[PDB]
Amino acid sequence: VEVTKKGDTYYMFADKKDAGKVVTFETESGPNRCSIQAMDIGHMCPATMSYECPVLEPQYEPEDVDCWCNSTAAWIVYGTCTHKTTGETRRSRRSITLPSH
Amino acid sequence: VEVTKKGDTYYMFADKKDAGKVVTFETESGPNRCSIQAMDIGHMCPATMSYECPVLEPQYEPEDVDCWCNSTAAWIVYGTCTHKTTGETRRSRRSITLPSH
Amino acid sequence: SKYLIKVENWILRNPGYALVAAVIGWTLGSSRSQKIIFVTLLMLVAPAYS
Amino acid sequence: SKYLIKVENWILRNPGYALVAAVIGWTLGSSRSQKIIFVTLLMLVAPAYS
Amino acid sequence: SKYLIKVENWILRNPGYALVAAVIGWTLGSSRSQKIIFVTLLMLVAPAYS
Amino acid sequence: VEVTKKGDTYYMFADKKDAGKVVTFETESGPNRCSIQAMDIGHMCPATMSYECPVLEPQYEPEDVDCWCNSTAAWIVYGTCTHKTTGETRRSRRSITLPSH
Amino acid sequence: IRCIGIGNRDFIEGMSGGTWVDIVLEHGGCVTVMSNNKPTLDFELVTTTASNMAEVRSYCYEANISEMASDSRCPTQGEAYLDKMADSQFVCKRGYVDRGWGNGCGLFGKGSIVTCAKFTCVKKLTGKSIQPENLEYRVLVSVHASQHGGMINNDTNHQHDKENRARIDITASAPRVEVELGSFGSISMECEPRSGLNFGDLYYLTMNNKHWLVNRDWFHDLSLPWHTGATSNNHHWNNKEALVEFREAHAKKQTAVVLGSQEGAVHAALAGALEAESDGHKATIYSGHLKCRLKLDKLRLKGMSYALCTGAFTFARTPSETIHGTATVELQYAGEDGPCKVPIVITSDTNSMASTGRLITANPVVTESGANSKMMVEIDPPFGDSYIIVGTGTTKITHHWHRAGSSIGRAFEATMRGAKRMAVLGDTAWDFGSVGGMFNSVGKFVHQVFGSAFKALFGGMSWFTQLLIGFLLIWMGLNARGGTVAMSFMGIGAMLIFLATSVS
Amino acid sequence: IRCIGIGNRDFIEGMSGGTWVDIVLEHGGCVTVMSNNKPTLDFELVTTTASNMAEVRSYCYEANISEMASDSRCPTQGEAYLDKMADSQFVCKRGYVDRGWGNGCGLFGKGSIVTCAKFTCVKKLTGKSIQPENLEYRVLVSVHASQHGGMINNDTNHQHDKENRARIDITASAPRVEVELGSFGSISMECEPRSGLNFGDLYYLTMNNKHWLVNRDWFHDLSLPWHTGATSNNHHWNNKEALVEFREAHAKKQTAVVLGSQEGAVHAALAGALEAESDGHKATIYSGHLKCRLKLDKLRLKGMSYALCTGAFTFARTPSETIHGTATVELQYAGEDGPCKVPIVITSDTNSMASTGRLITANPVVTESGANSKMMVEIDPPFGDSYIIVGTGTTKITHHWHRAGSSIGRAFEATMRGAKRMAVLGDTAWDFGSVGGMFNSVGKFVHQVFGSAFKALFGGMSWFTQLLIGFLLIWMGLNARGGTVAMSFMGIGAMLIFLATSVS
Amino acid sequence: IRCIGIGNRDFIEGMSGGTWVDIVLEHGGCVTVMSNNKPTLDFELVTTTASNMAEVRSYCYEANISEMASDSRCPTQGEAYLDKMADSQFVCKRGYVDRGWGNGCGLFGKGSIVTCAKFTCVKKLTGKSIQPENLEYRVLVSVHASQHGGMINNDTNHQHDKENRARIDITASAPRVEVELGSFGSISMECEPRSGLNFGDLYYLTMNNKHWLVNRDWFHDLSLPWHTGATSNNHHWNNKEALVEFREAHAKKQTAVVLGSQEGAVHAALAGALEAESDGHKATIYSGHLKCRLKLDKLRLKGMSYALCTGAFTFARTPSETIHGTATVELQYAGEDGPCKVPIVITSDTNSMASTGRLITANPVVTESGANSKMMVEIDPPFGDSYIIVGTGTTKITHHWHRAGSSIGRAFEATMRGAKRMAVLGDTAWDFGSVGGMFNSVGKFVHQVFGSAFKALFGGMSWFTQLLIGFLLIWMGLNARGGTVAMSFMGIGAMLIFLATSVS
């Protein structure tokens, strides 16, 4: 995965292949091993989901969390689409109805 | 992971540790390499989610599937609870309301 | 009930003498209702001569 | 239908003679309805002189 | 209030003498209202003889 | 599977055992490898489903087709019954109702 | 004796000189016919028989399918075609399905797909019609011959003397039948199967060795495959799509399925239906009445010329009583005198010795010449208390009997029943042909409607006083100048004169 | 003495010769019954007890799940099937999900998916019904025996003389009870639990060792799983889908979840509900009144035959005053004379020595024979100023007392209260059975409605002048020919004669 | 000749000296204008054209999303913040979610989460308004010049002689137009686009190269993203949350999704809507009538000075008959005489030779000088039987014709139609300005309402007898002293005198 810093904050460009595996990078404090458990991760495409995942103490196990690192809070970002066809999932099935007349 | 057969169907008892890795076992057809991408997998406890995951051709990418093997369809089962405290996640937040009086 | 059927059968057995007695007692009353009472009297005393 | 249109067109062709005949036959009836019958008679005999 | 209860209790203690005095003072007035004033006078002077 | 030709058209008698596997035969053009992905295939019995499955170019993926060969269009036929008990599935569950009186 | 234990029992009496007499038979009742010199007869209708019924339509509840085939063509190819379309045993459906490069051809449009399969009816039910010429009624005729009255002879195998009982099959082909009762004589019967249950709006449904009756307007409303009645090994069916369900839509094929056994649906729908029974191909119906006319010309008695019994008569048990106020007496005779007439009288006191009632069985007689024999008779005791005396001399036995009710009540009930019967006999009651039978017809029906009250009311049947009463009533009605008083009085007088002229 | 500190206090007085008397008890009040020769009694209703209540329905707020399983079939395969579907403990839901080559099979169509899981109720609440035959009321009876009046005996362990206090359990099975008060005597009570709070539209809800009462039309409206009304270790639940939430959809599975503890929702919904308490399986209700009838035949006094006190009487403190204008006096007696009657008088001046008021406690007496003993009494002072004198001789003590208000005001208030009470006693007030108690009933209720004013109004209760006034009023009403003036006057005269005939 | 095959056809005739004449044109009909010396004209309205329509609002049915971001803060941290909140192209939603040690921070409470994402409209539909100044009507004008009447010239490319047909575009800017018909002359037209279909409650909806009309009281009711009409590359949208469905908030994120194509929903909602067509940016409407006033001053004939035809006339086929009782005759002329006048007469008998009917086409003439040429004419035969004669000398041909109906019936129908037309012409019928045109206006409309009956009724149009009838009627109405009999009679007399003064 790509690791960059824009304005004193670390961005981790993770593609689809690196799904369910940890990665180690370097910060101003030192080495940081950060695990990623993204379940809805997709291929690389303009539709990019980005969310900060926070630092936590080792003793407390994660719960309903799919990203965690231990140096600081790290912002993760990854694409969300199907088979690199430049198309989002858009599976909402709301089926909004309009008045007849 | 444990691999058993009860009534001509294969059950794969997978614990929490084997999460995100493939496993190879033997069937009547031959060797079978089966990959597991279970996202909601938990520790071992009575609450056990079990679902058949099907065989498919290697020339297709998995879509909305977190388990696939290539000999036949294999039934996977795994516990779903937190920190082995014999407690489910039960994070529904439905907050059903009742009439006052 | 117990006596009506008996007097009825008696009337139906010999209706001539019964009608004779009835027409005799019909003309021995001062009023119409009195004649009716006199003929029902004959009707009642008909089964037993005594 | 077959004859009404013919006599109507005849009346509309020469209305002067038709009105003359009508006013002549109007004063030759004893009653109002009789005058009406006499003028409709003239109306009907108008197309064919014969 | 302070005197009404006293005279009321006095009337209720010996009502015979009170009614005697009332009927005596009733016939000692020139007008109806004057009789009422005379009997209320007796009612008021009743508790204390002095 | 048996491969015959009656009136310039090829019939492939496929039993239950050959389910989910390809087969190679010979035609007037040459060798033909034809794949069969029949899911509801059954044992041999009078109830026989038969449908032509068409030739297509290998540079396209199949979209709604479970049988495809590359010499010509091939007619496939196979029985549809349960456990060779001479009985069809007949699982319609229509439950047609009749007027009372 | 077949008419004793019947709830719906009637009594028919004809004129003394009147040979012909009309009756009505109900499927749940009986008819007793008596006369002055003729023996009592008992008519009953057992079963309505339907045979040789034609077939109208047959439905198929459970069916099978086989050899399902389909054919699909994508745009720029036209309609799909299959060789099995022209066959009447194969049903197909057409449709339009979306196609593309994944289905074989290039152009992006929807095509035409057709799918047919065979149809074989494994189980079926049938519907038959009922015609009036197919019906056949069965009537049993019994004769009061002082029989033992034992119920040990249920079937028709034996223990049925052919001179005491008989069976008659009334058909629509020949309604005129001649009945032979052996020594008793012969009678004639003309029965008209009319005014019965309507059979123009009923269908006889046969299904799974069971049978029902259904409505014609409902039989055609059923939504199932059907075919008319044609003798053949393979039949053409119509509207079979109601039993074969096709899937939604598939690009290259379509898999049809067949419905399961619809026996439960038919059993649930036929809950409120009438049922019947069948033997082989014939059916039995228990509903329907009948009208008949009997000619009794050669019918006579059997023991009219016999002598009296000089033996010993004894009761076999306490005489029973039926719902119609009739008393059955079972006698045992000791002695060897041969067939002799049974001297029996009904009176009011032991010293009176005067006949006060009538007998339902005419000429009671003993049948065998054995030493200790038995016999039975049926009589009608008068209202109130009475004494039945059997035998003569110092060996005659007496028995007390009581019967509740009133003579006027029974008379009015019998008059109302006779009026209802004459109202049921709407047609074929009178004859408007040759003259001479019109007066006979009016007299016959006025007798059959008023004799039950005439016998109960007008005294002791002296036949002499009643004539004088009729004469004086005619005279009183004649010497009256007022209207509406002479016509009715003369009519009543003539009615009474005629009713006294007949048998009492 | 249990009726002293009560806000809702009444006063009931019966006829001198009238043994029976009716009363009404409220769950928040008290009743004082007094007579001329009988000791004062004090009745109170403590708690309504409900026991042996049947169970109707139980709801489950907090539940758990386990063994979630799912099964998916794509088109041309039919509905999905699972072996756990036939089990009553496993709940499943069906659905249709989009499938493709990525999920295993090729044909693109919506497939059938089914998903079920076990259901176990970890915590639940219960609902019980209340029947009239289950209710049981508890009434305490106290006797004014000049007790010390100390509040040191709260429970029922000791310090409760069995001849001074008693408890009675009124049940629907036997409403007739016989109460023994020891030396005082015995009384009879017949109480009818009628016109109380309706228990046909109320359910007793038990939840988390707490209890409430709810409406029957609302109890069935609640949306939670529920079982049939039977006692079983495991019962077939119904409508459990309301506690198991299924996800939207997935191409191969479906993960169900269970809701959390719904205790907060129930606690919020039951905010405006009534509460109660329970012990073991019995429940306590604090709402509901009662009607009773007392028979006082064998009840007598205890110190009527005692002598006078020749010792020293002294006040223990300033006499207090209650809300009902009653004065409690606490006396201390010095000397050893044994149980002796307490000479106490109420007058208007120290030299008058004339009884002007009545006593709420009849026959004040000292209970022990000790040297320095104590006692208490309760009296009703007259309106205005008064003097209470205790003792005789040169050692008698006097005390001033004042009471505001008016005699007419108290009379009118008591009359209105008696009218309200008689209106509450709608049924079971009179008896329409045997004759002789109807006049007794009309006299009894006219007394109970008018005696409070009769005693307050008609002078000093001389019993001699009132009879003369009644006689003269009867005479004035008799010599009057006008209508509507003789009937009312004679009625009022008879009423006054009867009220003077009773106790004053 | 464009007005022959039209169901809704009228007939307008003006005064002889009256140059101005008013007419009404319907979008589904035609108007024929004839005069005494002027050639017959035929006016039709083809299409209503709407151009340069302004835009009011635009909706977005199908949309896409990208760059979804979220931010969550748990208690003791305040509200969540994101830099993309201030941007108008990013939509976010706020919410509160339960937090704990499992989610990152310590305190056990619920926090604030916000989530926004970009919004890009890939496909959209538009709404336009319609103003009266944008409408433009198109009217075609044809001239009866004895044309061949062949329908081979559909478009406007060729085969349209510019002196026989013309097109006119009536706009709201300049309602006064001058029409040039070449050799025939020039006319003037003033049309007022009033009393048409209301365009204040209609919106022109453009969607997917299709067009509809909708109600304003429903267009604003639709629940979809929208934005007003502003010329820009990037537009600000409002109420876009209706197309983006947010998933239930997770522990620390929120995944939004976008809805699919809503084209099917709009197509289903617009089922009962009116449709239209469009070319480029202009729209075509087929509903709406028009009122016009024609000034015919410089219009003349073309073949008035020509000579007679001395050739051979022949029928080309059996003369047809239209729904309005008009007869079209198609003639073929042989010979080379150049353009010559066609001698045609209509009479009642071959020997009578008297004009009994009128001609719809004035001055029938041959157009070319060819040897064998063809032409067409349209006439109105009299009710009943008639003879059409063509040519002179021994070569003239005759033909029989018949027409049903009655003259009075046609007169009454035409009078009622004229009354309806005058009622439609509510405004702009008369002029209340300068005096001298008011009498002209009243005469003009009384003529246009009564001339159809005047010509049909009053004899053979002798022009001499009618004046005498009018004079005698005026005299009869004058010598009458009674009220309500002189005014009406004098008015009718003056009306008849004026109608006879005009053209018959």
Ligand SMILES: *[C@@H]1O[C@H](CO)[C@@H](O)[C@H](O)[C@H]1NC(C)=O
């Ligand atoms: C993060 O945790 C890993 C776990 O092994 C450790 O190696 C690494 O040094 C940690 N980084 C820190 C504490 O900055």
Ligand SMILES: *[C@@H]1O[C@H](CO)[C@@H](O)[C@H](O)[C@H]1NC(C)=O
């Ligand atoms: C399943 O796929 C793996 C992929 O390496 C292969 O090694 C294995 O032989 C396959 N099993 C079969 C074909 O039965």
Ligand SMILES: *[C@@H]1O[C@H](CO)[C@@H](O)[C@H](O)[C@H]1NC(C)=O
């Ligand atoms: C079908 O495709 C296979 C691909 O390996 C090829 O070997 C075979 O020759 C083809 N059959 C033909 C072209 O008939």
